Structure formats: structure tokens, C-alpha cells
Amino acid sequence: HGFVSGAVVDGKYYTGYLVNQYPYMSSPPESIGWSETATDLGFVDGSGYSSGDIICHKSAKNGAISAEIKAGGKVEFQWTEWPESHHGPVITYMANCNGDCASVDKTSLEFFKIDESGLISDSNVPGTWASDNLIANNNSWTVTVPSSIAAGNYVMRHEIIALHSAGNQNGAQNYPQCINLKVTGGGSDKPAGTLGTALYKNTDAGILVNIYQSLSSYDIPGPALYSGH
């Protein structure tokens, strides 16, 4: 249980969608963070993987503004205090808005993976995951916008999948958080994108998984990190 309170985009801090505050305001500030209604700080599980909720979290609506970033620049995601029990991968996507991300139909967004991390060390079951690195780094995660992607407006979908109940069907807990980026400079790479509602199935190797028995390998779920980049 947690959410992204902010993002440092090419060195500039942007306040995210404060899901514990903005939903209760007469009129919340604009944010690069998408609004969403998981006001319990909860998750989308496998029962929701073909639902619109998996795209940018429960009933998500477009952030009204975007953060400019030179292609090649970094995004640092700031989470709330992530519970140690919520072991799992940290997966980050971009999708071209093909226009303004403020008015894109979230169900049209074609997500390509730009960063992924899973099981770091198996030594002491259930081991050290991306999510434990995130905790250790003051509950934050840094990714690169590839220097070679095409300039354009993109939703960056940042996600922790907690695997502590993933032993059972629909037990994995997805915590997607979307921000709006305006990528400048760049190259011409247009990686193959996947609809939010096609990213995961509840049978996937990295979704239906028992982290409490030693894993020889972990198969980070979702489409392939585009090898070009």
C-alpha cells in the first residue's frame, strides 16, 4: 500500500497526485500525476488486468499538465514508505500520447518498457527485490528516458508489483502510477507498445509465483524491454 507523492523530471521536482489529499479538496492543483480513486493506497490485482484500472490505477483521469525532459534525462519517482513485505519488481513504461497527454484516451495508450528490475538477490528467502532497493533509496526509483526515443508527449507508467500473496490466482498486487512527460530532442525510435489492458495475465510466470520458495530465476512480467535502445 503506497503511491507516488512526486517525481524529479530532468532535475526539477513535480508534486504528484496526492491521492490521500486531492480527492477531498473542493479543487485540487493540477499535476503531471494522473488522478485515481484508490484512496485506500491499494492495488489492481489480476481480476483487473483486462480492466481500464490497470492502465493508470483505479478510474484514472488525465493529469492536466506535463513535465519537460530532454531525451536521455532521468525521472526519479518518490513513493510513500513502501512496506518491506511488498517484495516484487519495479517496472516502468512510456506510451506516446500522439497529441496532448492531457486529452489522450488512456485505453489508446501503447506502453513500451523503458526499465525493469526484479529479484536482485535470492540469498535469504524471499530475498532482496527491486522494491527493497526502492525502500533502501529513501522510497525512490530512478529511470532514464532513452536518448534515442522520438520527441513527443508521453505518459510514463511506473509500477511496483507486490508478490507477497502472488502464490494464488489474482494474488499479485499492481500499483501503477502515471505521469505526463514532454520529451524534447531525442532520436526517431518508436518502440512497439502494448495496451495497458494487454500487459499482464493472472497466469504469467512473474505474476502467479511463490516468492517464499527459493527461485532459480524470476521472469519480470509484461512485454519485452525494447532491445534497440
Q: Which residues fall in the annotated binding site for (S)-malate?
A: 101-102, 182
What residues are designated binding site for Cu(2+)? 1, 86
Number of residues that bind Cu ion (CB under 5 A): 1
Q: Cell 518518490, residue?
A: 78
Question: Closest separation between CB of residue 163 and Cu ion, Å?
Answer: 12
190 scored as a contact of Cu ion (CB under 5 A): no
Determine which helix (DSSP H) or strand (DSSP E) holds 134, and give its type and residue range. Answer: helix 130-136
Question: Closest separation between CB of residue 98 and Cu ion, Å?
Answer: 34
Half-sphere exposure of 223 (CA within 13 A, CB side): 19
Q: Which is nearer to Cu ion, 58 or 106 (CB)?
A: 58
Contact (Cβ atoms closer than 8 angstroms) between residue 171 and residue 132: no
Q: Which is nearer to Cu ion, 40 or 105 (CB)?
A: 40
**CB-based contacts of 110: which residues, under 8 Å, 6+ apart?**
95, 96, 192, 193, 194, 195
* Per-residue mark of binding to Cu ion, 1-20 (x: CB under 5 A): x-------------------
Question: Closest separation between CB of residue 108 and Cu ion, Å?
Answer: 30
The angle formed by the CA atoms of residues 58, 133 and 14, to the nearest 5 degrees, is: 50
**CA torsion 55→59→64→68, rounded to 10°?**
-20
Q: Could you give the C-alpha distances from 106 to 53, 74, 137, 138, 198, in angstroms and in order?
A: 10, 23, 31, 30, 13
Q: Which is nearer to Cu ion, 41 or 205 (CB)?
A: 41
Q: Which is nearer to Cu ion, 42 or 127 (CB)?
A: 42
Contact (Cβ atoms closer than 8 angstroms) between residue 18 and residue 79: no
> Which residue is nearest to Cu ion, using beta carbons?
1
Question: Closest separation between CB of residue 4 and Cu ion, Å?
Answer: 15
Question: Closest separation between CB of residue 173 and Cu ion, Å?
Answer: 6
**Can you give the binding site for Cu ion, defined by CB under 5 A?**
1
